[PDB]
């Protein structure tokens, strides 16, 4: 509890140098499950630790993945409603950005403006800043496969392999173990689902379901969801890992 | 009472990661009675636990169901006045959305914008956020039977069977028991009124009245209220359940 | 005193789920006297417990009834000045609503917009929300006799017989006793003044004067005040009740 | 051909004192058929000389009568398209005028503003002034049966019996013969259809069809079209006249 | 050549009563080929006399039919570029009109506003009025099969069978011969293509191609083009007529 | 010289039906040289009859081809300055249109809005309408190879092979001779340069230079100019034709 009076409406700084809304949003991220994203050599594919709680839900729904453009997706974590509001405002802002650019969409300045809108609600006191994270990734030809992760603190870090959520530590160690630039996207995403559901603890956390969505060379550049054969294949691949 | 100074105007985060307005609105929902909604295979029909208190009321009035379009309804719970304000603003926004679309109304982006307006009043300090919930459901042909539940935290979750209100736990277990995709809407809605008024405790809660409203194939796609023969039929069906 | 820090500017929620401005406005209503309204089968007539305090007042003045349209009246309770401001803003809004509609005025969406303006000042912090209540009632032919009661919490409940003010409990029991749909308006309003001035306690409360105003079939659809013969007749009728 | 250079864009006056656009619009009116309107003692009913040309038309369509409000109609003559534009703009202006007034709609200032909009397009040079005429008539209780005829020159003349169109001379003589204030509306409108289709010359003009629409006491104040029994009855009544 | 100085910028009237822009636009319509539209009992189907001139054209292109909504089409004649501008502005205005209405689109006030925009450019002098015609037709269930023809003079006439273009006289006689309300749409549209390409003179006019597009019961309410089997079937049907 | 007083500022119509600005712009087009465009099966490639007059010019400059997007070009004819203004305004409008659309750019509604801006300056009198023509063509994968020709009269006609300029007659006959849909783009564009410089008369017209620019499959979808080897190859191919 660092801060007495500082952390009330902490747009005002404390002499540690820690804006306590950033700790709000980060701890809210580590309250939610661990979703990662990776920038392989001919695609950018995301993955979400989706949590099964009951039978009243809907499969295919409860989706923490969100299309932004034809090949731009949004792998959210944190709080879902503000992330969907960010998805809508980023939809209109990606409309403005493929206005601005002539070719297919160059994710750099796109994610810069999206992170600008993220950090713009972080120095006032009307409502809260966005206590959620999300990952933007685009695959192209004239500019290639790009991946950028907008933190809740507005400092958008790009990655060849990223990790947000609860168990970010083991996830980022295992991402820094893998060959994030070398192999093709398909084996690497099998390894992604494999190792992330190794990281899934089945006792402290409840039941789980695979959540993943393509974009790359074999999917004709479309931001496709992972199909049911490849979904069950990655499920069996993670089960081969978890049986050991 | 998690939060000392955090939960004053809790647009500012606390280091747990829990925006305390969301707990305001959720506990306000569990203070009100339990209303559910279900997405059957040829319709989307809602249901409200309506509470009888006195004879000064009006039957047909005290309606916690609200038409939004010709086949779009709003099954509210929480606080009624802000829910009716949301009904009016969603009426103009559904006007803007059936402006935007060419066919009959595609509830997805509709409920996205409605949940955006829900979460937009959740980071300021002029007045409160909406301490109420509501369910949007549309039945169509070119896009089908769609159901979406906008939480008070702005993360609109769609469902094949949903549940909000006080006794959400037993209600969502019984919804995850039923065949929410398999049987026709009529037997399923009989089972809905049946099991929800099983869940109605007559001692801790006061007297009750059935509240339900159609839209589906037999109702010519009109968002009709359940008629008095089908109302008394579902009453007798729930009484057949409650006699056991 | 539920709420420590919550109830300062309680647009922010407390984890009970009770927006404390609603308790401000409701307790302010139960501080003021008990005024009721009833929707009989060929009219909508209001009634106010008017309190005699001194001889410096003016009879015909101190009116807690307010015309809104030619057949739309406003039976206020709570605080009078904000209720008159609501009367003025509802005058311009009823102007906008009989702009919008072609026939005589359909009170439903009218009272919806009025209750929207009521609840719109309930989530900010510049000045207070409206700590007062009022009843809207319209009698027509193409749409009939309609009655709607806008609470201070913005959830406008319609009634066939309503009751607001201090002694709402005994008043609403006696309204749920009477035949609010069956007899003609004239005998029912005699019973209204009768039973409401039975409910008037002459010891704890000070002296009283009858306040009532017609609209119905015999008054040519005009929102007339109750005339002096019918006023003294209802006074004598309540005295016949109170002599027992 | 009075005017050499004057009548080019005759917003500029000629020293006769005749704005030649008024002669454009009047001669355009006398090019179209003769439609009259009459203000009887408990209604205001219009009538149009409708011209049958071929079988490709639609009966009930080709309507030169236009509803403006629930009891306000528009009996047009001249050019039909600008008259329908005047019908639309008068629809929004009647919306603004039943905004302004509290009771049912007082046609006087309504037709004043409509004639103001008529004459407002008569001193410029972008497009033409309205080369058409129309009759406004309202029947009420608090203000009664009112009839007003807006000329194309903007000087709205009210009438107890009016006449516009081609054979205005014989029509206005026969209107000044009849009892426009004395008898009930039904016999008078039978006499209207009678004498106007006496005035219809079947050789110089082509085939004809009766066009008439009620508003009055028997029609519950609704601006109804004349029903088929009363239509064929007035046809037979005019045939009884024309057989002589 | 009626009018010396009048017909220069003929927003100013001449004392005949004939706005010479209406003669511009009508003679421009009779310069273009004859396209008709008909309102059969379960659909509204259009037809265009398309003129084959060379092999450099594109079949399926040179389309004088234009979709406005999912079941609203635009059968143009006159000048094509201003008709496509009217198609675009009517696209945004139909967006505004299915904003305004709750059910499927009621063509009446739609075509009223479109004809208002037609006549609005007819009294100024910046550029020309629209020297082209078009036909709007909608098929529905709650409001049915509606057909409306907006003339270039802004007086939108609805029809059960219409005809615009060059040989309007023989076309409208043959439309007033046929059973425009009685038979099903399919045989009637075969008769439409039959008789209209009887009316096509192959000597004075050059080569022709069938142009027709459905909307009705068998086409699932979609404004479909006539398929190639039904196109060649109607070609052979017109050839069976023309062989006699 | 059809029209006495009509053709002064001919936004006003003449009773022939010929807006004389369209004849201004068309005769201005036939004053300039003949440029064609063709929609082959895997590309849309343009071609301009460029006229050599002196040595003071610049090769690569005097370009009557204009890039609009990465694969959208503009083959102009008529007057060059207004065509470059149309190129700039179409650049911003194509920015607005690839705002609006999600995939690569769908030329249909693009050219519709561009032709709307063309025809929008054709009914006023401040400055002239655009006395020039231009051809828009886009090659894609999700929507394909599209070609559209915006006339100066605003009626944008799409083509599989088009022709504008001076000798449009022989050019369009030879385009309707060729296989505009069958062969690959490369041989067809060789035939284009071949036959168009057959059509070039070297006596009445002065010296000429080849002007052509690709977009298609071999050019990686880039709107490339024809390279110097393929330029001189098409020159030699046209010389092989012209030697006969």
């Amino acid at each position: 509890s660092i801060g007495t009076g500082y952390d009330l409406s902490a747009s005002t700084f404390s002499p540690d140098g820690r804006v306590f809304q950033v700790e709000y949003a980060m701890k809210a991220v580590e309250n939610s499950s661990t979703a990662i994203g990776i920038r392989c050599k001919d695609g950018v594919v995301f993955g979400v630790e989706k949590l099964v709680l009951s039978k009243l839900y809907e499969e295919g729904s409860n989706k923490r993945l969100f299309n932004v453009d034809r090949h731009v997706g949004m792998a959210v974590a944190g709080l879902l409603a503000d992330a969907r509001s960010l998805a809508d405002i980023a939809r209109e802002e990606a409309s403005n950005f493929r206005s601005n650019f002539g070719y297919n969409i160059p994710l750099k300045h796109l994610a810069d403006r999206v992170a600008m809108y993220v950090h713009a609600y972080t120095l006032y006191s009307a409502v809260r800043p966005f206590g959620c994270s999300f990952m933007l990734g685009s695959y192209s030809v004239n500019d290639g496969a790009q991946l950028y992760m907008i933190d809740p603190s507005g400092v958008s870090y790009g990655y060849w392999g990223c990790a947000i959520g609860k168990a970010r530590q083991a996830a980022k160690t295992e991402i820094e173990k893998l060959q994030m630039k070398e192999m093709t996207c398909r084996d690497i995403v099998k390894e992604v689902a494999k190792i992330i559901y190794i990281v899934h603890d089945e006792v402290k956390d409840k039941a789980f379901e695979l959540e993943l969505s393509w974009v790359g060379e074999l999917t004709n550049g479309r931001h496709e969801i992972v199909p049911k054969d490849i979904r069950e294949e990655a499920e069996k691949y993670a089960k081969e890992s978890l049986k050991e």
Side-chain angles (χ1 to χ4, degrees), chain A residues 29-151:
Chain A
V29 166
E30 292 110 16
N31 287 318
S32 181
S33 65
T34 300
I36 72 166
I38 193 162
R39 183 179 175 181
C40 49
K41 64 183 181 181
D42 52 352
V44 175
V45 179
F46 300 103
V48 176
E49 184 181 0
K50 185 168 73 175
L51 300 174
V52 174
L53 297 174
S54 176
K55 300 295 189 292
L56 295 175
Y57 293 95
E58 188 69 29
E59 292 180 354
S61 177
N62 300 113
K63 191 184 265 79
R64 298 175 70 185
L65 293 169
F66 292 97
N67 285 316
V68 180
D69 201 358
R70 66 177 183 177
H71 61 276
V72 181
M74 187 175 175
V76 303
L79 190 60
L80 185 63
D82 289 331
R84 290 180 178 178
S85 70
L86 287 169
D88 292 331
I89 275 89
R91 184 69 57 85
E92 286 105 15
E93 199 271 323
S95 178
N96 197 0
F97 190 69
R98 200 171 179 180
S99 318
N100 291 318
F101 204 79
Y103 296 95
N104 291 322
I105 181 164
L107 187 66
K108 295 182 183 178
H109 187 271
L110 178 69
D112 288 330
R113 296 294 295 164
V114 172
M116 185 66 204
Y117 185 79
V118 167
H119 193 273
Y121 288 166
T122 60
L123 289 175
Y124 291 158
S125 65
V127 293
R128 62 186 173 183
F130 292 100
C132 64
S133 297
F134 58 95
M135 293 178 185
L136 292 178
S138 70
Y139 173 72
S140 64
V141 177
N142 291 319
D143 289 331
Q146 294 178 356
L147 177 61
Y148 286 93
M149 188 273 287
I150 292 94
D151 59 352

